[PDB]
């Protein structure tokens, strides 16, 4: 072709070649991801090049872990990655709707219709679908029951059913705990710690914090009941001078004096801590826990142990905020003027050893605006799966809270939007009615795949559901256990309005751009 006359080692896909390539890759991705959809979906096992195992049903994880080197697949993976970064859910449905839009558009483009006209119809249908979505969204007071139904709707798709019944309460309580009225939810304030010793149904919500380290002095207590928490960011180990200094002495006695003196600077901070401890705990009734974002040398650790303080070192820059929000003190970068008001309270602090690692629990706080989810499980891959699931569930509940509206699930909104688009089609001018029809039949891929995965006839189930929705007008979806139509709003199967809107927008746009691609070209080689 033209490009190969200038760069002989160039690869080129023109007009029909380009479209066939892109649609084929999209349909391949769709064929892989069709099985992820819904609670009746199948778990995939993924083995890295090192031999590491991942068990996932998550569309984004599956995408990034699959072994693919296709440009269209890269485009769609990036669109799904954005969907996940912003909403946390919707990647599988995103890929499926993209693939189905491309297929339904190829159906008409093979018959000589222009992709520009198909994309115009796509744009019209997108507009009408966004309108219908805004119309059908259910504005609801976000109560614990609604949030529980939402988090269940996500976790039951992502993990096993009993583990979903546990993680639902865990996630909803965590969000209802770190949430302040009319103030965007900072999900950073929900720590997620994994422990690898017990069953997966032991995953719980600690109304406090769990640090992945403990005290490094053996004489330090392993359990403290009524603890003053000092969150600090002050080095308690030996610090050398910025300017190169060095010590000069003429006698072993002078060397000894200099050895005792060189630590006075850090001894003073230890003395400040110890004096605060003595001033706030006049006896051994209460406890005192220092948590330092920086180091603590053995001398300081010994000095604090002698006074009965539990010192943890090299905490996390996020744990500074998490501790000041859970306990309720002030995080310090200096001990210039520290006061008892700088301290937090924890009604219990103790340590838990698991093989070679130690954990520190900080619980019984008063009203912690920061909590942690302790992911317990017997395997690293189980823990990873639960981590992904709780990410999905947290994003789901956060979005349901932010957008006080919530949309019915189980393909109900997709069916209804298809019907609305098909009734709207005549109002579209020209052969963009075919693009509208393609958009509608593409939206209809969610109930189709749900039925396919529950083990039902796609056409029969979809005709039943569309008939019920046209006869009654109720937003109805797939019952994955009987294949019958069911009212998602009545049975508690809810999706995120933000997720559906992002689906419509991003899927329409990327499908339009792919359809309008007319030449794939690799010519960067020297």
């Amino acid at each position: 072709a033209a490009v190969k006359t200038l760069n002989p080692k160039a690869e080129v896909a023109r007009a029909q070649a380009a479209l066939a390539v892109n649609i084929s890759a999209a349909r391949g991705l769709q064929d892989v991801l069709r099985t992820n959809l819904g609670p009746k979906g199948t778990m995939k096992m993924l083995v890295s090049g090192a031999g590491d195992i991942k068990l996932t049903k998550d569309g984004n994880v599956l995408l990034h872990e699959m072994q693919i080197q296709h440009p269209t697949a890269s485009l769609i993976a990036k669109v799904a990655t954005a969907q996940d970064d912003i909403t946390g859910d919707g990647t599988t449905s995103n890929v499926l709707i993209i693939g189905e839009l491309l297929k339904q558009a190829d159906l008409y483009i093979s018959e000589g219709l222009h992709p520009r006209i198909i994309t115009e119809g796509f744009e019209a249908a997108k507009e009408k679908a966004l309108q219908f979505l805004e119309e059908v969204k259910v504005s609801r007071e976000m109560d614990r029951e609604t949030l529980i139904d939402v988090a269940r709707t996500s976790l039951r798709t992502k993990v096993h059913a009993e583990l979903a019944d546990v993680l639902t309460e865990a996630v909803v309580d965590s969000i209802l705990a770190i949430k302040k009225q009319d103030e965007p939810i900072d999900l950073f304030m929900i720590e997620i710690m994994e422990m690898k010793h017990k069953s997966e149904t032991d995953t719980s919500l600690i109304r406090g914090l769990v640090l992945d380290h403990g005290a490094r002095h053996p004489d330090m207590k392993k359990r403290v009941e009524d603890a003053y928490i000092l969150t600090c960011n002050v080095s308690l180990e030996y610090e050398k001078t910025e300017v190169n200094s060095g010590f000069f002495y003429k006698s072993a006695e002078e060397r000894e004096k200099l050895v005792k003196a060189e630590r006075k600077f850090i001894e003073d901070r230890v003395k400040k801590i110890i004096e605060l401890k003595r001033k706030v705990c006049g006896d051994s009734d209460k406890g005192f826990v220092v948590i330092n974002q920086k180091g603590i040398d053995p001398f300081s650790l010994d000095a604090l142990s002698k006074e009965g303080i539990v010192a943890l070192r090299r905490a996390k820059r996020r744990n500074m905020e998490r501790l000041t929000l859970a306990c309720g003190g002030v995080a310090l970068n200096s001990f210039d003027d520290l006061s008892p008001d700088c301290l937090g309270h924890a009604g219990l602090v103790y340590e838990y050893t698991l093989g070679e690692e130690k954990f520190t629990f900080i619980e019984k706080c008063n009203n912690p605006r920061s909590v942690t989810l302790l992911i317990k499980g017997p395997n690293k891959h189980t823990l990873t799966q639960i981590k992904d699931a709780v990410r999905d569930g947290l994003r789901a509940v956060k979005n349901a809270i932010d957008d006080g509206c919530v949309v019915p699930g189980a393909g109900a909104v997709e069916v209804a939007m298809a019907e609305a688009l098909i009734k709207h089609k005549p109002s579209v001018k020209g052969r963009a009615q075919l693009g509208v029809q393609a958009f509608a039949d593409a939206l209809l891929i969610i109930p189709k795949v749900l039925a396919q995965n529950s083990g039902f006839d796609l056409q029969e189930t979809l005709v039943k559901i569309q008939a019920e929705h046209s006869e009654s007008g109720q937003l109805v979806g797939v019952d994955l256990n009987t294949g019958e139509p069911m009212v998602a709003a009545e049975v508690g199967v809810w999706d995120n309005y933000c997720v559906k809107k992002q689906l419509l927008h991003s899927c329409t746009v990327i499908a339009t751009n792919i359809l309008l691609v007319d030449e794939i070209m690799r010519a960067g080689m020297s």
Binding site: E11, A13, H70
Partner: protein
């Protein structure tokens, strides 16, 4: 995302080294580019001022010529569209013998203008329609452009003046001599019947001297020697045998079965007496020259020498047949003496030495016969081969004149008149066909343009002068190569003329080749073997 995959379908099912081109860009334009490159390779050889090329083929053989069809044959053209244009040029060479370079130039021009029209927005179908209607108009016009006719092909001055033009493009410096030679030969072998055979003009290329020492010979020349002792004969009574000059033997295995000392003693003497009887019967028929297509036996040669017979051995069977045509004899498959009709006659048969080469000459004295030979002298084998090609051009022109005696003016005069008239026809023809008609017309301008460029003058000034004179009314005016500046003159009065049939067939074949190249839309090459 670092590799573009082959699209599903034909792109994947295609074999390893196979190629597939489709559409105006990948197929049509690339074919037009290939044919344009071909026309460019052969353009600088067009006309009397055309320069020669020295093509070396894969066999390390050297060809020095400005004959388009020869150059094409000796080039290894590998692009299929160019191959098709070459097929057209070779068909022109076969049908007419001259005009291959016209075919190339015109086809390349038609294809360039077709590319232009496709770029301005016409469809290959419309271009082809317009090209076909314009070729039809050109064929309708040319008979009216015919200016003179031969009026006599038994003369030698008229025939020489007629062949001079065809033998001017090749061998421009020395064309009057060559036209004299070829006219002498053609009118010698031209029979009272209107049929003329080009194979009856033989060409003998002998090393030494130069083209001004070339001559015509009413008879035949063979780079052979005589088998026997006799070398000259003045009243030849030639007897021709397709069989060897030996005793006939059985086609089934023969065995000499001896059973007695007498048979053993007498066998060889009987064999020799038999051979003596055979050759004496041949000599007594009056034959003084015997020509055998097979081998000669020692005893038969002995007795031919005894009875004073000149023996000649022609290895080739075409050589034997042509000698028979020359002398009026019949090849006898048996060694039986020939009857009065089976014998041939020549006013002389002798052995001569032209240069280093020894030759046997069957020479008639009469200025006629069935075969004539042109003995080409020259200082180089390549030069003599080029002069032989020029001779072939002249002889094929003579045959074209025997077929159709009509002549059109050369030096671009007919081309300019055709361009003008077809432009005037396209200006009246409405619809999208007028663009293609006008481009077909402008294509004719490529001929005087190529003539001018090789003459060494400004082709645009030449073409403007020609258009002006043909507008004022002179249809026989073409360009003057004997002018350092752009000039023009009366092609008829100058005697520069082409053959109606030559132009007719050249136009037809060039148009058909271009139209086929355009009709191609997809190309599926296979993996080049090797």
């Amino acid at each position: 995302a670092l590799h573009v995959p082959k699209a599903p379908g034909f792109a994947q099912m295609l074999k390893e080294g196979a190629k597939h081109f489709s559409g105006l860009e990948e197929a049509v334009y690339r074919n037009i580019q290939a044919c344009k490159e071909l026309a460019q390779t052969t353009r600088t050889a067009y006309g009397p001022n055309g320069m020669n090329k020295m093509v070396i083929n894969h066999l390390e053989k050297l060809f020095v010529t400005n004959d388009a069809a020869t150059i094409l044959r000796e080039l290894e053209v590998q692009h299929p569209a160019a191959k098709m244009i070459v097929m057209a040029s070779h068909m022109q060479e076969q049908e007419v013998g001259d005009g291959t370079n016209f075919v190339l130039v015109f086809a390349g021009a038609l294809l360039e203008l077709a590319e232009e029209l496709l770029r301005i927005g016409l469809s290959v179908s419309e271009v082809i329609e317009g090209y076909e209607i314009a070729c039809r108009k050109a064929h309708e016009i040319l008979p009216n452009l015919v200016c003179c006719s031969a009026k006599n092909l038994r003369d030698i001055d008229e025939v020489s003046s007629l062949l001079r033009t065809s033998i001017m493009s090749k061998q421009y410096g020395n064309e009057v001599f060559l036209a004299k030679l070829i006219a002498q030969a053609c009118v010698s072998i031209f029979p009272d019947s209107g049929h003329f055979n080009v194979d009856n003009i033989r060409v003998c290329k002998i090393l030494g001297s130069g083209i001004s020492s070339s001559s015509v010979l009413h008879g035949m020349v063979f780079k052979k020697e005589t088998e026997g002792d006799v070398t000259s004969v003045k009243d030849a009574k030639i007897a021709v045998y397709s069989c060897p000059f030996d005793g006939m033997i059985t086609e089934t295995k023969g065995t000499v079965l001896i059973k007695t000392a007498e048979e053993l003693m007498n066998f060889s003497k009987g064999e020799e007496n038999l051979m003596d009887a055979q050759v004496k019967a041949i000599a007594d028929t009056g034959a003084n020259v015997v020509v055998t297509g097979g081998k000669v036996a020692d005893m038969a040669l002995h007795y031919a020498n005894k009875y004073n017979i000149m023996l000649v051995r022609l290895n080739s069977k075409w050589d034997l047949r042509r000698l028979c045509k020359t002398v009026g004899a019949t090849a006898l498959p048996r060694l039986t003496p020939p009857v009065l009709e089976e014998m041939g006659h020549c006013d002389s048969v002798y052995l001569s030495e032209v240069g280093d080469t020894q030759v046997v000459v069957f020479k008639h004295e009469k200025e006629d016969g069935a075969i004539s030979t042109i003995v080409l002298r020259g200082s180089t084998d390549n030069l003599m081969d080029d002069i032989e090609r020029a001779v072939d051009d002249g002889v094929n022109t003579f045959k074209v004149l025997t077929r159709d005696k009509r002549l059109v003016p050369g030096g671009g005069a007919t081309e300019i008149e055709l361009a003008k008239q077809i432009t005037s026809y396209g200006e009246t023809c409405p619809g999208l066909e007028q663009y293609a008609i006008k481009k077909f017309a402008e294509a004719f301008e490529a001929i005087p343009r190529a003539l001018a460029e090789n003459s060494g003058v400004k082709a645009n000034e030449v073409i403007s002068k020609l258009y002006a004179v043909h507008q004022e009314g002179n249809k026989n005016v073409g360009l003057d190569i004997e002018a350092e500046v752009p000039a023009v003159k009366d092609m008829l009065e100058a005697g520069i003329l082409d053959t109606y049939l030559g132009k007719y067939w050249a136009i037809k074949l060039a148009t058909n080749a271009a139209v086929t190249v355009l009709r191609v839309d997809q190309i599926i090459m296979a993996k080049p073997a090797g």
